């Protein structure tokens, strides 16, 4: 249950959880004394007393002081507990979100995912910090003053326990509706976030094709739906608070009718009954506030359900092992890549890559080039197969120990909005050295244009590194990959947008490194493949042919086709 | 001023803006009657009256009905007005955000921009919808009760107008502190959003380099800073509401001391003084509520300032013109691209492109390849130069009329998370035809794998179209570009990730189109450049050489270097 799990998050706050009770507890004892205060002043003034009459002024300053000190400490602690608990929620949510599999990222766009911690969790803050204080107040205060009301006269008060089911039904019935609608408005917000996020991502596409008008219609429709849902939610919530007062007002009228009969009014002591009316009003107000905060309470519950679903989602796994890979020799054996959608791209595959080799994959597009690499780094779980990395199961090695020792250059190079040095030295090697980055840049051929930048290595990039160049942005990935001195360098189309001269120097640097690795090259070119130790012709996953550059040319086959 | 401009947004709501006042006005009158109700009941009971005693119960259900009907109608209208106003804000904010220049997108990442409408505007909703009602109540009700208080006894009430400067200073002084801090917390949230958005974008990079631990520290630091700022803001708020009660409580103590002197107590008629105390308490409660909601009120103002800064930001411009471009002939003349950062890449450039030509740009990377293209589409304003599109100024043509008739293929292909058919037919041509998409796919060579997809042309893509393939994702851009039948096709590195076979068919289709255009090709290859009508060798912006494929080879120069 949502409520049960929330309590588990405030376990270390029990010591502070009772201080807030005391602070409002004194406040609960402050608003009950007013009923006694009115009776006391009426008795003193009615009897023309002077000793207890001139003493009244000191009783409101002292009384109000309790409405202050005690209200602040109790009122301020509510924010502390709720804000601290949410801080441990969003912070802990980030860990699982980062540890989630790449498949989850594919299914949900940035707008949907970001709204789940930026808005979903955000509403939980205002729905908990403000709601917890309001509910505990409109609780303990009402409880205390109603207990006092029972003590002064139990006979009349017991009549109040007749309409209680009516208020319960009017609130329970009026709460399930908002709970159902609360999840709907949150879902609509995700669509709103998705449209803006996609528009930001595709600004280049949006402006080029004059799609701004089309984007507005979808965003306008989503905003209209959200507004209608909010207005509908307001109708039910705002309709409940006045109604619950009407039934309580009828109860007050009935109890007054019962009490004010002449046979019961023989000796009333009006000062006593006016205290009763004041207590009744001081119950009516807090219950009205409790009914008003119903929307705030319900909003948090809907957010909590989605948050905990995200927490329970099936994140990645681990095995436990630590090895240096001794120049890991990757040996695929009957590996398949049956995707969730249904497409099959690694139907059949097998290799015996040896340490120090330069195996490269060449073939037609849409065959599984950048799909087999993912399972090597564990970005995609294997199906009906396994990989023997260093003559041992790949799964047995930890993800941290595996990804940290495998340099990668993705087809779509991603650059963070930070300084150039941080991007080149991003990751576990953020504290490598102040000169290692220079060596990596020189090897990658990026040590010529960085100095030409306005600031140099400490220049902040753009939104996604668009401001460097069409080709320079790619060199940053190569630079960081070479900086990461792992004995693996999967150059997955690393030299795609680079110029003829720039790529030639990078190939020369790779050849001259004199630190032979098991680098895998996936390039749609012959210059990089001409020097490959072994060339594997792959089409639709199946290995069409294998051999060296000379062997394939003599055999012709499919390689001869890709030689025009 | 923020307040002045906000009123301008509710101009058409003046008809409903007065109905809410009546609802609160009736509610305000109800709050007045309670003080009269206590006096009436005490006078009736004190005199042992029966005609006005048994009639009292009918004055509670009727009185509460006014606390209902009137509170609901006016209470629900507050949400309607505020929610409708914000709906016209976020909806109108979207238009300017989409019309903003590409430079603004570069400066601010997605997280900063998205948080300015998803959180900045979102806080304005709760800071206005639930704040406007609270201020209207803590106003009308208090004003009416105070007017009644003055009427019954003006002599005593006048003493209240001494502490008023004290409460004003305690509130005015405490308001600027939160206003300054309100902007700080909002700024911190933008950093929180930035980390999450960048992590979502770079999940491939984050996982590959084991950077999850590094990301957590930055996110953890931002969350801690936000929590500390919020806690500091909470201290200011909760420390104000009890204090204003203390000074007001002292005022009431002094006034009661002045009033209760024996000389003034000759004929007190206790029933009237208890009404005085009830009015005093029912004034204390709403002012406390006003102080409490001061926090939400201040939160909205900080958001409003940033929102209006975004609204006032310098969006793009327009001129006003319409033409078919008659196969627009591009004639660059003394064009420069002095960037905002400072780098220069179009130092010198001039051309006389003619209709039906196939001019292509070839040169070294980092020279200005994908920077001059932005001019023709107005993604970047020209400096100390101009472009004559159809022997007329480019600026004179409307942006919509210009972008809508210029097919573009950006180096970084962006695919939206939608169906394939919508993505291929995205933009002004969303209603082209049910068969034209097939022709475009066949021309681009994309009508071979789409049918092999799980659903086909109506299959939802991933977050950014990552699930097609490394090369297929590029073909979608080519498909939409060819579908858009403008007399321009700037193939800016269109064939980069495509294989040798796919690119050949696309080139053949372009040649066979038999619809000669002014297509511009920016490719680091020779297959597309061999058949180019004119080849321009560009280095560092300056035109190194011009001529046909045969001419450049004979002249050697830099072209001979780019031939190995
Ligand atoms: C200008 C100076 C400000 C500063 C200051 C000024 C003063 C101080 S102080 O030291 O004196 N402190 C207080 C003084 C007065 C007060 N207040 C009073 O006595 C009235 C209390 N409410 C009422 O009697 C009342 C009664 C019935 C009402 N409506 S009903 O009959 O329909 C109805 C009745 C029952 C139900 C539910 C039935 C469930 C069985 C439903 C409907 C209403 C209404 O309509 O709201 C109101 C409080 C304090 C304090 O301690 O909180 C301290 C500081
Ligand atoms: N927003 C920008 N801020 C600063 N410099 C920029 C910006 N955009 C481009 N440049 C520079 O302008 C020059 C041209 O780069 P670009 O627009 O990518 O064309 P290009 O480099 O010739 N194509 P490519 O070789 O694939 O990068 C380079 O020196 C870039 O660093
Ligand atoms: N997440 C996915 N969902 C569905 N199909 C996928 C997914 N990832 C890859 N595929 C398919 O698997 C095949 C392999 O594609 P991909 O992983 O891009 O390697 P590739 O096509 O050989 N490299 P490239 O030629 O540059 O695209 C293609 O048919 C893709 O459509």
mmCIF file of N, CA, C and O in Angstrom, chain A residues 50 61 72 76 83 87 94 98 100 105-106 110 113-114 195 197-200 203 206-208 215 223-224 227 235 238-239 250 260 288 365 403 411 417-418 426 463 470 484, chain B residues 50 61 72 76 83 87 90 94 98 100 105-106 110 113 137 195 197-200 203 206-208 215 223 227 231 235 238-239 250 260 403 411 417-418 426 463 470 475:
data_model
loop_
_atom_site.group_PDB
_atom_site.id
_atom_site.type_symbol
_atom_site.label_atom_id
_atom_site.label_comp_id
_atom_site.label_asym_id
_atom_site.label_seq_id
_atom_site.Cartn_x
_atom_site.Cartn_y
_atom_site.Cartn_z
ATOM 1 N N UNK A 50 -14.516 42.030 39.480
ATOM 2 C CA UNK A 50 -13.379 42.875 39.133
ATOM 3 C C UNK A 50 -12.049 42.146 39.216
ATOM 4 O O UNK A 50 -11.153 42.416 38.412
ATOM 5 N N UNK A 61 -2.585 37.378 25.543
ATOM 6 C CA UNK A 61 -1.183 37.413 25.140
ATOM 7 C C UNK A 61 -0.512 36.085 25.459
ATOM 8 O O UNK A 61 0.205 35.514 24.629
ATOM 9 N N UNK A 72 4.884 27.466 15.413
ATOM 10 C CA UNK A 72 6.060 27.557 14.556
ATOM 11 C C UNK A 72 6.860 26.262 14.581
ATOM 12 O O UNK A 72 7.163 25.690 13.529
ATOM 13 N N UNK A 76 6.873 24.333 11.412
ATOM 14 C CA UNK A 76 8.127 24.298 10.669
ATOM 15 C C UNK A 76 8.667 22.881 10.524
ATOM 16 O O UNK A 76 9.318 22.571 9.520
ATOM 17 N N UNK A 83 9.972 17.571 3.293
ATOM 18 C CA UNK A 83 10.992 17.946 2.320
ATOM 19 C C UNK A 83 12.180 16.996 2.378
ATOM 20 O O UNK A 83 12.725 16.608 1.338
ATOM 21 N N UNK A 87 13.399 14.562 -0.583
ATOM 22 C CA UNK A 87 14.781 14.662 -1.038
ATOM 23 C C UNK A 87 15.405 13.282 -1.188
ATOM 24 O O UNK A 87 16.135 13.022 -2.152
ATOM 25 N N UNK A 94 16.760 8.770 -8.865
ATOM 26 C CA UNK A 94 17.752 8.996 -9.911
ATOM 27 C C UNK A 94 18.631 7.769 -10.115
ATOM 28 O O UNK A 94 18.981 7.427 -11.251
ATOM 29 N N UNK A 98 18.970 5.852 -13.693
ATOM 30 C CA UNK A 98 20.233 5.710 -14.406
ATOM 31 C C UNK A 98 20.603 4.245 -14.607
ATOM 32 O O UNK A 98 21.229 3.900 -15.616
ATOM 33 N N UNK A 100 18.493 1.831 -15.121
ATOM 34 C CA UNK A 100 17.492 1.138 -15.912
ATOM 35 C C UNK A 100 18.079 0.698 -17.252
ATOM 36 O O UNK A 100 19.038 1.292 -17.748
ATOM 37 N N UNK A 105 14.561 3.303 -21.924
ATOM 38 C CA UNK A 105 14.791 4.604 -22.542
ATOM 39 C C UNK A 105 14.162 4.665 -23.928
ATOM 40 O O UNK A 105 13.580 5.687 -24.312
ATOM 41 N N UNK A 106 14.276 3.580 -24.696
ATOM 42 C CA UNK A 106 13.695 3.550 -26.034
ATOM 43 C C UNK A 106 12.178 3.697 -25.981
ATOM 44 O O UNK A 106 11.593 4.465 -26.754
ATOM 45 N N UNK A 110 12.078 11.428 -23.645
ATOM 46 C CA UNK A 110 12.615 12.252 -22.566
ATOM 47 C C UNK A 110 11.502 12.977 -21.818
ATOM 48 O O UNK A 110 11.535 13.074 -20.586
ATOM 49 N N UNK A 113 9.767 10.621 -19.343
ATOM 50 C CA UNK A 113 10.621 10.230 -18.225
ATOM 51 C C UNK A 113 10.910 11.424 -17.323
ATOM 52 O O UNK A 113 10.850 11.316 -16.093
ATOM 53 N N UNK A 114 11.233 12.577 -17.913
ATOM 54 C CA UNK A 114 11.585 13.741 -17.104
ATOM 55 C C UNK A 114 10.407 14.192 -16.248
ATOM 56 O O UNK A 114 10.587 14.584 -15.089
ATOM 57 N N UNK A 195 5.468 16.907 -25.886
ATOM 58 C CA UNK A 195 5.400 17.784 -27.052
ATOM 59 C C UNK A 195 6.493 18.843 -26.986
ATOM 60 O O UNK A 195 7.204 19.090 -27.967
ATOM 61 N N UNK A 197 9.296 18.788 -25.234
ATOM 62 C CA UNK A 197 10.620 18.178 -25.310
ATOM 63 C C UNK A 197 10.966 17.799 -26.745
ATOM 64 O O UNK A 197 12.080 18.055 -27.218
ATOM 65 N N UNK A 198 10.020 17.183 -27.455
ATOM 66 C CA UNK A 198 10.267 16.812 -28.844
ATOM 67 C C UNK A 198 10.456 18.047 -29.715
ATOM 68 O O UNK A 198 11.286 18.047 -30.630
ATOM 69 N N UNK A 199 9.689 19.106 -29.452
ATOM 70 C CA UNK A 199 9.871 20.349 -30.191
ATOM 71 C C UNK A 199 11.261 20.926 -29.961
ATOM 72 O O UNK A 199 11.916 21.388 -30.903
ATOM 73 N N UNK A 200 11.731 20.910 -28.714
ATOM 74 C CA UNK A 200 13.076 21.400 -28.425
ATOM 75 C C UNK A 200 14.111 20.556 -29.154
ATOM 76 O O UNK A 200 15.074 21.080 -29.726
ATOM 77 N N UNK A 203 13.804 21.320 -33.088
ATOM 78 C CA UNK A 203 13.789 22.703 -33.557
ATOM 79 C C UNK A 203 14.345 22.844 -34.971
ATOM 80 O O UNK A 203 13.770 23.549 -35.808
ATOM 81 N N UNK A 206 11.722 21.288 -36.996
ATOM 82 C CA UNK A 206 10.479 22.051 -36.897
ATOM 83 C C UNK A 206 10.559 23.308 -37.754
ATOM 84 O O UNK A 206 9.651 23.604 -38.541
ATOM 85 N N UNK A 207 11.647 24.066 -37.615
ATOM 86 C CA UNK A 207 11.795 25.293 -38.390
ATOM 87 C C UNK A 207 11.936 24.996 -39.877
ATOM 88 O O UNK A 207 11.361 25.701 -40.715
ATOM 89 N N UNK A 208 12.692 23.952 -40.225
ATOM 90 C CA UNK A 208 12.962 23.668 -41.631
ATOM 91 C C UNK A 208 11.678 23.374 -42.397
ATOM 92 O O UNK A 208 11.497 23.852 -43.523
ATOM 93 N N UNK A 215 2.710 21.655 -34.524
ATOM 94 C CA UNK A 215 3.058 21.381 -33.133
ATOM 95 C C UNK A 215 2.103 22.084 -32.177
ATOM 96 O O UNK A 215 1.750 21.536 -31.126
ATOM 97 N N UNK A 223 -3.097 20.888 -23.776
ATOM 98 C CA UNK A 223 -3.341 21.901 -22.756
ATOM 99 C C UNK A 223 -4.831 22.056 -22.480
ATOM 100 O O UNK A 223 -5.242 22.209 -21.325
ATOM 101 N N UNK A 224 -5.657 22.026 -23.529
ATOM 102 C CA UNK A 224 -7.100 22.116 -23.335
ATOM 103 C C UNK A 224 -7.622 20.924 -22.544
ATOM 104 O O UNK A 224 -8.470 21.081 -21.656
ATOM 105 N N UNK A 227 -6.654 21.424 -18.942
ATOM 106 C CA UNK A 227 -7.478 22.453 -18.319
ATOM 107 C C UNK A 227 -8.868 21.920 -18.001
ATOM 108 O O UNK A 227 -9.413 22.188 -16.924
ATOM 109 N N UNK A 235 -14.587 21.019 -9.637
ATOM 110 C CA UNK A 235 -16.026 20.966 -9.388
ATOM 111 C C UNK A 235 -16.334 20.014 -8.239
ATOM 112 O O UNK A 235 -17.047 20.366 -7.291
ATOM 113 N N UNK A 238 -14.607 21.335 -4.797
ATOM 114 C CA UNK A 238 -15.246 22.523 -4.243
ATOM 115 C C UNK A 238 -16.696 22.271 -3.856
ATOM 116 O O UNK A 238 -17.234 23.000 -3.016
ATOM 117 N N UNK A 239 -17.336 21.263 -4.447
ATOM 118 C CA UNK A 239 -18.709 20.914 -4.113
ATOM 119 C C UNK A 239 -18.816 20.105 -2.828
ATOM 120 O O UNK A 239 -19.901 20.040 -2.248
ATOM 121 N N UNK A 250 -27.047 21.094 9.934
ATOM 122 C CA UNK A 250 -28.304 20.465 10.327
ATOM 123 C C UNK A 250 -28.162 19.752 11.664
ATOM 124 O O UNK A 250 -29.078 19.782 12.495
ATOM 125 N N UNK A 260 -32.500 23.243 23.793
ATOM 126 C CA UNK A 260 -33.135 24.495 24.189
ATOM 127 C C UNK A 260 -34.578 24.324 24.659
ATOM 128 O O UNK A 260 -35.288 25.327 24.789
ATOM 129 N N UNK A 288 -13.790 22.035 7.658
ATOM 130 C CA UNK A 288 -13.855 22.649 6.337
ATOM 131 C C UNK A 288 -12.479 22.685 5.687
ATOM 132 O O UNK A 288 -12.336 22.383 4.496
ATOM 133 N N UNK A 365 23.695 -2.246 -45.008
ATOM 134 C CA UNK A 365 22.973 -1.570 -43.940
ATOM 135 C C UNK A 365 21.753 -2.384 -43.522
ATOM 136 O O UNK A 365 21.206 -3.172 -44.298
ATOM 137 N N UNK A 403 31.642 -2.282 -18.419
ATOM 138 C CA UNK A 403 31.523 -1.046 -19.184
ATOM 139 C C UNK A 403 32.716 -0.127 -18.958
ATOM 140 O O UNK A 403 33.108 0.612 -19.867
ATOM 141 N N UNK A 411 27.349 5.517 -32.843
ATOM 142 C CA UNK A 411 27.064 6.133 -34.134
ATOM 143 C C UNK A 411 26.564 7.561 -33.957
ATOM 144 O O UNK A 411 26.999 8.478 -34.663
ATOM 145 N N UNK A 417 26.443 19.400 -22.205
ATOM 146 C CA UNK A 417 26.605 20.853 -22.165
ATOM 147 C C UNK A 417 27.535 21.200 -21.006
ATOM 148 O O UNK A 417 27.118 21.625 -19.926
ATOM 149 N N UNK A 418 28.829 21.008 -21.245
ATOM 150 C CA UNK A 418 29.854 21.270 -20.244
ATOM 151 C C UNK A 418 31.106 21.765 -20.960
ATOM 152 O O UNK A 418 31.090 22.032 -22.165
ATOM 153 N N UNK A 426 35.204 12.678 -19.438
ATOM 154 C CA UNK A 426 33.967 12.352 -18.745
ATOM 155 C C UNK A 426 33.964 10.891 -18.317
ATOM 156 O O UNK A 426 34.453 10.016 -19.038
ATOM 157 N N UNK A 463 23.906 22.936 -26.537
ATOM 158 C CA UNK A 463 22.896 22.051 -25.966
ATOM 159 C C UNK A 463 23.360 20.600 -26.003
ATOM 160 O O UNK A 463 23.270 19.881 -25.001
ATOM 161 N N UNK A 470 30.352 19.970 -37.388
ATOM 162 C CA UNK A 470 29.767 18.706 -37.800
ATOM 163 C C UNK A 470 30.693 17.528 -37.574
ATOM 164 O O UNK A 470 30.238 16.431 -37.239
ATOM 165 N N UNK A 484 40.395 6.793 -22.428
ATOM 166 C CA UNK A 484 40.078 5.611 -21.629
ATOM 167 C C UNK A 484 40.963 4.466 -22.103
ATOM 168 O O UNK A 484 40.724 3.872 -23.156
ATOM 169 N N UNK B 50 -38.558 33.582 24.649
ATOM 170 C CA UNK B 50 -38.913 32.350 23.960
ATOM 171 C C UNK B 50 -39.216 32.544 22.483
ATOM 172 O O UNK B 50 -38.928 31.646 21.689
ATOM 173 N N UNK B 61 -28.829 26.812 9.864
ATOM 174 C CA UNK B 61 -28.894 26.162 8.557
ATOM 175 C C UNK B 61 -29.002 27.206 7.452
ATOM 176 O O UNK B 61 -28.349 27.096 6.408
ATOM 177 N N UNK B 72 -19.152 28.321 -2.932
ATOM 178 C CA UNK B 72 -18.843 27.417 -4.036
ATOM 179 C C UNK B 72 -18.800 28.164 -5.363
ATOM 180 O O UNK B 72 -17.839 28.033 -6.128
ATOM 181 N N UNK B 76 -15.368 28.370 -6.964
ATOM 182 C CA UNK B 76 -15.048 27.661 -8.198
ATOM 183 C C UNK B 76 -14.639 28.613 -9.313
ATOM 184 O O UNK B 76 -13.853 28.234 -10.189
ATOM 185 N N UNK B 83 -6.963 29.382 -13.985
ATOM 186 C CA UNK B 83 -6.573 28.291 -14.873
ATOM 187 C C UNK B 83 -6.708 28.700 -16.334
ATOM 188 O O UNK B 83 -5.852 28.363 -17.159
ATOM 189 N N UNK B 87 -3.719 28.989 -18.987
ATOM 190 C CA UNK B 87 -3.832 28.241 -20.234
ATOM 191 C C UNK B 87 -3.471 29.116 -21.427
ATOM 192 O O UNK B 87 -2.778 28.669 -22.348
ATOM 193 N N UNK B 90 0.726 29.582 -21.086
ATOM 194 C CA UNK B 90 1.579 28.501 -21.570
ATOM 195 C C UNK B 90 1.348 28.245 -23.054
ATOM 196 O O UNK B 90 2.299 27.985 -23.802
ATOM 197 N N UNK B 94 4.307 28.901 -25.902
ATOM 198 C CA UNK B 94 4.800 27.907 -26.849
ATOM 199 C C UNK B 94 5.094 28.534 -28.206
ATOM 200 O O UNK B 94 6.095 28.199 -28.851
ATOM 201 N N UNK B 98 8.758 28.434 -29.990
ATOM 202 C CA UNK B 98 8.991 27.812 -31.288
ATOM 203 C C UNK B 98 9.526 28.813 -32.303
ATOM 204 O O UNK B 98 10.311 28.440 -33.183
ATOM 205 N N UNK B 100 11.501 31.296 -31.602
ATOM 206 C CA UNK B 100 12.776 31.840 -31.169
ATOM 207 C C UNK B 100 13.893 31.402 -32.114
ATOM 208 O O UNK B 100 13.789 30.369 -32.782
ATOM 209 N N UNK B 105 18.322 28.322 -28.695
ATOM 210 C CA UNK B 105 18.343 26.891 -28.415
ATOM 211 C C UNK B 105 19.750 26.426 -28.065
ATOM 212 O O UNK B 105 19.938 25.617 -27.149
ATOM 213 N N UNK B 106 20.753 26.923 -28.791
ATOM 214 C CA UNK B 106 22.132 26.539 -28.517
ATOM 215 C C UNK B 106 22.567 26.985 -27.126
ATOM 216 O O UNK B 106 23.182 26.213 -26.382
ATOM 217 N N UNK B 110 18.074 21.715 -23.244
ATOM 218 C CA UNK B 110 16.661 21.362 -23.176
ATOM 219 C C UNK B 110 16.132 21.475 -21.751
ATOM 220 O O UNK B 110 15.004 21.936 -21.535
ATOM 221 N N UNK B 113 15.282 25.090 -20.833
ATOM 222 C CA UNK B 113 14.141 25.617 -21.576
ATOM 223 C C UNK B 113 12.850 24.936 -21.138
ATOM 224 O O UNK B 113 11.826 25.598 -20.927
ATOM 225 N N UNK B 137 -10.518 36.182 -0.273
ATOM 226 C CA UNK B 137 -11.189 35.894 0.990
ATOM 227 C C UNK B 137 -10.610 36.744 2.116
ATOM 228 O O UNK B 137 -11.294 37.616 2.669
ATOM 229 N N UNK B 195 20.356 18.350 -15.263
ATOM 230 C CA UNK B 195 21.085 17.105 -15.040
ATOM 231 C C UNK B 195 20.265 15.914 -15.515
ATOM 232 O O UNK B 195 20.784 15.011 -16.184
ATOM 233 N N UNK B 197 17.782 15.807 -17.741
ATOM 234 C CA UNK B 197 17.625 15.794 -19.192
ATOM 235 C C UNK B 197 18.910 15.353 -19.884
ATOM 236 O O UNK B 197 18.875 14.551 -20.825
ATOM 237 N N UNK B 198 20.055 15.868 -19.432
ATOM 238 C CA UNK B 198 21.325 15.468 -20.027
ATOM 239 C C UNK B 198 21.601 13.990 -19.789
ATOM 240 O O UNK B 198 22.117 13.298 -20.673
ATOM 241 N N UNK B 199 21.274 13.489 -18.595
ATOM 242 C CA UNK B 199 21.446 12.067 -18.321
ATOM 243 C C UNK B 199 20.568 11.225 -19.236
ATOM 244 O O UNK B 199 21.010 10.195 -19.759
ATOM 245 N N UNK B 200 19.319 11.643 -19.443
ATOM 246 C CA UNK B 200 18.438 10.912 -20.348
ATOM 247 C C UNK B 200 19.014 10.914 -21.757
ATOM 248 O O UNK B 200 19.009 9.889 -22.449
ATOM 249 N N UNK B 203 22.360 8.625 -21.774
ATOM 250 C CA UNK B 203 22.318 7.285 -21.196
ATOM 251 C C UNK B 203 23.293 6.335 -21.879
ATOM 252 O O UNK B 203 23.969 5.547 -21.208
ATOM 253 N N UNK B 206 26.479 7.642 -20.645
ATOM 254 C CA UNK B 206 26.566 7.478 -19.196
ATOM 255 C C UNK B 206 26.880 6.029 -18.844
ATOM 256 O O UNK B 206 27.767 5.747 -18.029
ATOM 257 N N UNK B 207 26.156 5.089 -19.453
ATOM 258 C CA UNK B 207 26.389 3.679 -19.163
ATOM 259 C C UNK B 207 27.743 3.221 -19.689
ATOM 260 O O UNK B 207 28.452 2.462 -19.018
ATOM 261 N N UNK B 208 28.123 3.680 -20.884
ATOM 262 C CA UNK B 208 29.354 3.198 -21.505
ATOM 263 C C UNK B 208 30.574 3.523 -20.652
ATOM 264 O O UNK B 208 31.465 2.681 -20.485
ATOM 265 N N UNK B 215 27.300 11.476 -12.189
ATOM 266 C CA UNK B 215 26.044 12.194 -12.380
ATOM 267 C C UNK B 215 25.292 12.348 -11.064
ATOM 268 O O UNK B 215 24.667 13.386 -10.814
ATOM 269 N N UNK B 223 20.134 18.854 -5.651
ATOM 270 C CA UNK B 223 18.984 18.564 -4.802
ATOM 271 C C UNK B 223 19.207 19.072 -3.385
ATOM 272 O O UNK B 223 18.286 19.609 -2.759
ATOM 273 N N UNK B 227 16.946 21.825 -1.508
ATOM 274 C CA UNK B 227 16.337 21.543 -0.212
ATOM 275 C C UNK B 227 16.721 22.601 0.813
ATOM 276 O O UNK B 227 15.875 23.055 1.592
ATOM 277 N N UNK B 231 14.149 25.095 2.679
ATOM 278 C CA UNK B 231 14.074 25.134 4.135
ATOM 279 C C UNK B 231 14.294 26.548 4.655
ATOM 280 O O UNK B 231 13.605 26.993 5.580
ATOM 281 N N UNK B 235 11.621 28.950 6.819
ATOM 282 C CA UNK B 235 11.889 29.638 8.080
ATOM 283 C C UNK B 235 11.305 31.044 8.052
ATOM 284 O O UNK B 235 10.668 31.486 9.016
ATOM 285 N N UNK B 238 7.092 30.747 8.178
ATOM 286 C CA UNK B 238 6.483 30.332 9.436
ATOM 287 C C UNK B 238 6.859 31.247 10.594
ATOM 288 O O UNK B 238 6.137 31.279 11.597
ATOM 289 N N UNK B 239 7.963 31.985 10.487
ATOM 290 C CA UNK B 239 8.339 32.937 11.524
ATOM 291 C C UNK B 239 7.587 34.257 11.423
ATOM 292 O O UNK B 239 7.732 35.100 12.314
ATOM 293 N N UNK B 250 -1.272 41.935 21.117
ATOM 294 C CA UNK B 250 -0.953 43.017 22.045
ATOM 295 C C UNK B 250 -1.871 44.212 21.826
ATOM 296 O O UNK B 250 -2.287 44.871 22.786
ATOM 297 N N UNK B 260 -12.243 48.124 29.325
ATOM 298 C CA UNK B 260 -12.823 47.490 30.502
ATOM 299 C C UNK B 260 -12.634 48.300 31.783
ATOM 300 O O UNK B 260 -12.774 47.740 32.878
ATOM 301 N N UNK B 403 11.303 28.802 -45.601
ATOM 302 C CA UNK B 403 11.604 27.486 -45.051
ATOM 303 C C UNK B 403 10.696 26.417 -45.648
ATOM 304 O O UNK B 403 11.133 25.288 -45.896
ATOM 305 N N UNK B 411 22.882 17.297 -40.777
ATOM 306 C CA UNK B 411 23.888 16.275 -40.505
ATOM 307 C C UNK B 411 23.435 15.347 -39.387
ATOM 308 O O UNK B 411 23.574 14.123 -39.490
ATOM 309 N N UNK B 417 9.145 10.915 -32.056
ATOM 310 C CA UNK B 417 8.567 9.685 -31.514
ATOM 311 C C UNK B 417 7.108 9.607 -31.954
ATOM 312 O O UNK B 417 6.175 9.901 -31.203
ATOM 313 N N UNK B 418 6.916 9.200 -33.205
ATOM 314 C CA UNK B 418 5.587 9.093 -33.793
ATOM 315 C C UNK B 418 5.600 7.945 -34.797
ATOM 316 O O UNK B 418 6.551 7.161 -34.859
ATOM 317 N N UNK B 426 5.948 14.732 -42.097
ATOM 318 C CA UNK B 426 5.858 15.737 -41.049
ATOM 319 C C UNK B 426 5.994 17.133 -41.643
ATOM 320 O O UNK B 426 6.756 17.347 -42.590
ATOM 321 N N UNK B 463 12.536 6.978 -28.714
ATOM 322 C CA UNK B 463 12.632 8.324 -28.159
ATOM 323 C C UNK B 463 13.012 9.336 -29.231
ATOM 324 O O UNK B 463 12.422 10.421 -29.308
ATOM 325 N N UNK B 470 21.030 2.318 -37.873
ATOM 326 C CA UNK B 470 22.005 3.385 -38.012
ATOM 327 C C UNK B 470 21.851 4.157 -39.308
ATOM 328 O O UNK B 470 22.071 5.371 -39.341
ATOM 329 N N UNK B 475 17.472 7.589 -43.769
ATOM 330 C CA UNK B 475 16.621 7.508 -44.952
ATOM 331 C C UNK B 475 15.290 8.216 -44.742
ATOM 332 O O UNK B 475 14.700 8.725 -45.702
#
